[PDB]
């Protein structure tokens, strides 16, 4: 049952472009007494409370995306998806384009998020949750 | 530097990136060329779903099917400064290839043959090829 995995939470300094890809490979856990969550932050890395141009949060059939700007969270973009099957390893992709983030799970489009803060201000990628994280790749 | 021509077996998806880094040469008696093939890898003369070609301020993109090239898509660009390192990106999406040079969008190429049929990446030209990466 043993397998190699990355620290959780996982941090990585980044510089995004208009043609930039993050590929996460992970598996949801079965936490004691709660549903597993998954959270990916494209943050400014300016410390606690610093801006988060794009947070991707998933739990129990629900995706919530949002932006933290000047200590304030904005209007949520919220959808239902069946893409994250518990116990099944998944591949989660973020594509950074000039106009939006595009999100894919297992090679299928899930949702898109129009930029609310400049992609150029993202400095820190942050992956965490009730997951076993096996790889995080960026190009 | 890397072999030139450069070959790499590939398997594309609807969210797939090729990043090429290279220095454009200044050959004595010609303008340096650059060529990238997204091909089926079915032997010489096999179909080529997408060829990207650059020389002398001109890009030409086309598809080789059943031994014949289709209607080109041709355009001008100043992005390849001769003598300078460049970075060339192909983004494979469900509907098209997207081309970027030095983090700037250049042109797009709607799929004519299925992206799933591409098996071999070929990169060549009057370049010093320093790296080729895919995700």
């Amino acid at each position: 049952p043993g397998m190699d995995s990355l620290p959780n939470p996982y941090l990585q300094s980044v510089s995004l472009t208009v043609c930039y890809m993050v590929k996460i490979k992970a598996n949801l856990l079965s936490p004691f007494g709660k549903n597993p969550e998954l959270q990916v932050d494209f943050g400014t890395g300016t410390g606690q409370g610093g801006d988060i141009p794009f947070r991707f949060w998933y739990c129990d059939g629900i995706v919530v995306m949002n932006t933290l700007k000047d200590g304030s969270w904005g209007k949520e973009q919220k959808l239902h998806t069946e893409a994250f099957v518990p116990g099944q390893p998944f591949e989660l992709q973020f594509l950074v384009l000039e106009n939006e983030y595009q999100v894919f799970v297992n090679n299928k489009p899930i949702c898109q998020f129009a930029h609310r803060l400049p992609l150029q201000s993202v400095k820190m990628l942050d992956v965490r949750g009730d997951i076993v994280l096996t790889s995080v790749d960026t190009l």
Side-chain angles (χ1 to χ4, degrees), chain A residues 1-47 49-139:
Chain A
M3 50 177 298
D4 291 23
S5 68
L6 293 170
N8 172 4
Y10 175 98
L11 298 177
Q12 185 186 318
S13 305
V14 294
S15 323
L16 307 188
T17 67
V18 298
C19 186
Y20 190 96
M21 181 186 304
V22 174
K23 180 189 293 180
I24 294 156
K25 286 172 178 287
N27 200 341
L28 286 171
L29 293 177
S30 302
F32 197 26
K34 61 172 194 259
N35 288 320
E37 312 178 1
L38 161 70
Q39 188 176 271
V40 180
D41 279 358
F42 293 77
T44 57
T46 63
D51 288 336
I52 303 184
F54 172 41
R55 161 169 295 182
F56 176 89
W57 178 87
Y58 167 79
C59 181
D60 192 32
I62 302 286
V63 168
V64 178
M65 303 167 283
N66 209 351
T67 294
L68 176 64
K69 179 179 175 163
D70 294 312
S72 188
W73 286 99
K75 182 187 184 289
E76 295 182 337
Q77 180 178 340
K78 182 190 197 103
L79 66 138
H80 296 67
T81 174
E82 290 311 293
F84 302 96
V85 185
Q88 304 314 288
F90 60 89
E91 175 177 319
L92 167 66
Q93 278 175 296
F94 295 94
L95 183 53
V96 190
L97 303 182
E98 65 85 22
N99 52 315
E100 59 185 12
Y101 304 86
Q102 307 197 334
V103 178
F104 300 76
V105 173
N106 297 328
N107 309 310
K108 297 166 109 191
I110 301 314
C111 56
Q112 307 75 46
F113 188 84
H115 292 297
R116 307 192 195 164
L117 286 170
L119 65 88
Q120 296 77 6
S121 60
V122 176
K123 304 292 163 193
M124 175 67 54
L125 173 79
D126 183 309
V127 179
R128 68 176 66 204
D130 310 292
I131 64 172
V132 172
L133 180 65
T134 62
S135 69
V136 176
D137 290 289
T138 69
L139 184 69

